[model samples]
Target: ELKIGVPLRVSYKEFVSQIRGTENMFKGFCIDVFTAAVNLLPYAVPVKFIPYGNGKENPSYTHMVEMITTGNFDGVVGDVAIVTNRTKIVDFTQPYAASGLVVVAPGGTPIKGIESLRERDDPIGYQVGSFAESYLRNELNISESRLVPLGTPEAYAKALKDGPSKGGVAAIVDERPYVELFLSSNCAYRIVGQEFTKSGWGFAFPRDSPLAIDLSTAILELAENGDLQRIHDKWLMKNACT
Candidate 1:
């Protein structure tokens, strides 16, 4: 059996979330994609999933990648964002999904962009250690005074509707997967601004791992054979945006 490392998050349910009623098995876009890709290989090697979350909200991606370098797992098969720094310790396959950061607010809030928050003192929620947090502090120059760091995307989504004064937040800035799933599951939220920063979702492995080329080839083949789009349609076609 090939051991696979997976990250856990209460938010981003569409990408990596709990499989309700099941015992430790996760079910989501990333899980689905990995399973499908493995099936396409010439031989079948069962996967032993090692989920890295326990009551804690968001786990560190940098540390998760380190597990592979330390020979703790064969590879990571979760919804890990492929960024430059992590690439230094681990290698990534060709991206199978597109990701970015977005701002969302309660329905009928009438806010459109970050500019609308300039006059408000209420805090904006974002996942800790996320690109959204970095962008909020660096690119948008949003100060920590008005920022409420949350553990998961789902937590931020829930806090947004409660409003900042109620120990919630006035808005939530997070990844597109969380926003998309949140918007789809709950009609009470809306996107406040266009997405910023293009990110890619890729399977992570130790540097120069041979699995990279095989997994990349399988992903490309699935894309060409319509399997990839079918998976996309299965999870996303019912989303509110469409």
Candidate 2:
């Protein structure tokens, strides 16, 4: 792990050992795909599932990217989605899957989707560093109230479910797969239309790691073999637009 100086602390020995044992309970759409693709690798590598932390300044992507950019980690296994403007500072793998952004709310929320908000100039909440955030900020032409950027999903969820960010925060912006995963039989929400932004996800790397190229091949291979869609069906089927 070369030091790109984002925010990870590890001696070379620990970095090597950490990389040796990863790949446990990987979640997140992009990550699941990465693990499936990496399984094709002949080399015996593992990806340790790090619990996603909630915070004010450090969101999921930022924390993960910090590990990759700094020296505590080797590479990350998930959608660094969007070739973020930050990629010039780090490195991103090829897009493994392409989807769309949707506004999600718990069942019974008055906000059906983004359209409802757009129609009445309602506010929407999204975690700060997500594709959904990019969608509302970059795609939707609305005021800041229209884009309630929070630091954590809990905050976003709380805002979308209950609070000032609540009423007008009629919806949240994020990938359909993720929203679908949480909105189950008991949970319900409707996605309104074509996503505002083309949602694609990839992996992250420090500035010039060979791992970037390696994972890109793995991602493409999954897509070529139609495994990507299979995973989608397994994880991303839900009432998004209905």
Candidate 3:
């Protein structure tokens, strides 16, 4: 059986819920892709979805990856970004989705890029434990006082709407998929500036896991057959911004 770890806070990538008397239901883009890939395999792979998070906050993704090394999970299926630091400990499937950091600000804000954010005194928001947070702190060298590590997309949106003068963030830096998800319904905010960094979302497994290669092949097949695009459209293209 494959013990799969799913992230708790990524909106479109994974959603977990328990129906009164039934087992937990894990659904969303990541779940769909994982399921489809597994189905393509000749042998059936029994799997269990274990969510990683405290109910009140986003779990640390670095810790989640460590859990796989610690033998707590066989794999992780969600919006896990494939980064250099993580590659040393675990193997990642070919990125199923292209992603990178982008800044989000209110519609009328003049923010053009990461550099423009430093021109204002307002705080900036980023999801805690995300690549965006690491980029802001280590790469961009934003001071701690001006950076807010939020747990969810809604928190980012709320902080941006609240504005820095009113105790909220003036801008938010996050992954492109997440920013696009937020903009889908909240049309008042716009993604500003070119995306910073280059990354992709991939499923993670312990180093040299045989399953990783199989899944990567499955993902490539999915891409070739257009199932990947169909799944992407199903989750991301719906209710899109005008």
Candidate 4:
């Protein structure tokens, strides 16, 4: 049996819910893609999902990936971004979601891109332990004092709503898919400028894990057969803002 760690962050990627008398039910875009890929495999792969997050906090994806090396999980199947540092420890399957970092601020904010935040000395919000946080620190060199690390999307949204003067952020930086999901339901915010960095979400397994190649092949087949597009539309195309 393959033990897969699933991030518990709520977004288009994965949603977890507990029923009155059964195991927790997991659903959402990543879950659908995972299931489809597994079904397309030449042989059955018995898998189990071990959610990796406290009920009230956003999980550290970096820590979750490292857990595989510690024998806590065989692999991770969720919105795990394919990043350079992570690749040194684990192999990632073909990206199921093509994504990039983006900046989001209130609609009509004068912000045009990430640089605008620095120029204006705006306090910025990003999920703690996320790639966005790293980008702000390492790539953009934003001062640590100007950065506000939050745990969940709700916290980011609230921080944006509060504005910088009220001890909140002037803008929120996050992955495009997540920011787009937030915009879909909350029309008050908008993505500013083009994507600043290139990235993708992929499944993760320990380095040299034999299952990596098979799953990567499955993902490629799903993309070529158009199953990937269908799954994306199912989860993201509805209720979008104008």
Candidate 5:
């Protein structure tokens, strides 16, 4: 089994939204991609999920990156672009999916829109190692304000759940089922506005992994035949939110 370190909030709800997603062989998007890639490979590399949530506090992605750097894990998956700032840390594969950041909150909070996300005077919540936080810090021009650090999305969701009636801090997550799933649950938290950043997701590897080209080729083949599109459309809920 190949030890894979996927982001805590990558939004592969096809499995996780249900009861058996935690199973080693659950057929999710990344699972399908990895499985098909393995089929093309000389060996069968099943996904033994390492459950690495992004954030230094949580020790999931942080631990896994250290592990990969030390040759413990295989690959870490997420929006790994803009690593021009971090190439000294780890290498990455080509772009996989077009993704961006969104601010999520319970539906009826005082925070009604994304404009509020920009130019923050208040503390905004962000996962420790996610591009969401990075966008808020480096690209979105909110460097002056403090970011309310959280370990994971589930933790953020729960925080939103328990915040005061006016709302606590806003959290920025990806643009998929997390927003959709949370919004559909008829909760008070809502994702306000269109996406903030435009980028693609990639797999991170240590500088030494020869598997980079192998995974890139497999992703291309799958994209060519419309396999990736099918997986994306199947899990994305059309009416979850606006």
Candidate 6:
């Protein structure tokens, strides 16, 4: 059996809580992609998902990548953003999904849109160590004093409800898949700005893991045969919202 590291963070409808009162398991687009692609392999390879953290926290990607390097996991299969730093330590299969960063604001606020944020001193929230946080600091010129690092999207959601004056934030910047997933389930939040950058998500493996080549080939075959698009349409399409 191959043990794959699955990041526990929610990615919209891709990775969601399947625990109903006590049962613990995961199901979503990323899981579906992992399992379905593996099924396309020429020989059957038994696989199981080992969640790396709880849903409410953002675990370090560096550590997760290192775990593969040290053999703690055979590879990782989930919504790990393909960034430069992670690529330094791990090899990624070709991207199977599209993603980017977005800014979301409290649901009931009267704010017009992204323009409301420019030149405003109100604090903004972001997950600690996320690309979104870094984008805010360097690309957007958002000052550190006005930034709140909440550590997880769930935490950021709660902080938004608290509002700016009560130690919450006026807005939060995070990955698009998560923001869209959160918005689908809640009516009180909305995206404030357009996507700030373009990125893709790919399965990760230890440097030179043979599994990377096999998985990449399977993904491409699935894509060419339309099964991959079927999975995307099932979980991330217009009518898939809750």
Ranking by lDDT: 4, 3, 1, 6, 5, 2
- Per-residue lDDT tens digits for candidate 2, residues 1-242, read 22221211121111111233442333444545766776877675655545333322534565566665556666655545654565766777777767567767656655665666666666776656564655555666657656776654445556656644535366677665445544543243455555656636666667886666787888778888988888777655565334
The C-alpha TM-scores of every prediction are: 0.81, 0.63, 0.90, 0.90, 0.67, 0.77
Pairs of residues at least 3 apart in sequence or in different chains that clash in candidate 2: 22-46, 22-47, 22-48, 23-47, 23-48, 191-240
Residue 182, model 1: lDDT of 69
Model 3, span 55-122: residue lDDT tens: 45767777888889999999988788898878889999889889998889886676777888977666
lDDT of 6 by residue, 82-134 (tens): 87768888898878777887778865565445557756878888766466666
The lDDT for every candidate, in the order shown, is 0.77, 0.56, 0.80, 0.80, 0.58, 0.73
> Model 5 reaches what TM-score against the true structure?
0.67
For residues 43-142, what per-residue lDDT tens digits would candidate 5 score against the true structure?
Answer: 5656666555432243334445666777666776543443444445667656666656677865665555567656446557765555455556676677
Model 1 scores a TM of: 0.81
Q: Pick the candidate with the highest TM-score.
A: 4
- Per-residue C-alpha lDDT of model 4 across residues 102-205, encoded as one tens digit per residue: 98998778688887887878888887668677767777788888889877667777898889989998888888887876777678888888888887988898
Candidate 5 or 1, higher TM-score: 1
RMSD of each: 3.2, 7.2, 2.2, 2.2, 4.9, 4.0
Cα lDDT, model 4, residue 12: 40
The RMSD (Cα, Å) of candidate 2 is: 7.2
On lDDT, the stronger of 1 and 2 is: 1
User: Which runs of model 6 end up more than 4 angstroms from their true locations?
Assistant: 10-25, 54-56, 106-120, 134-144, 149-158, 237-242
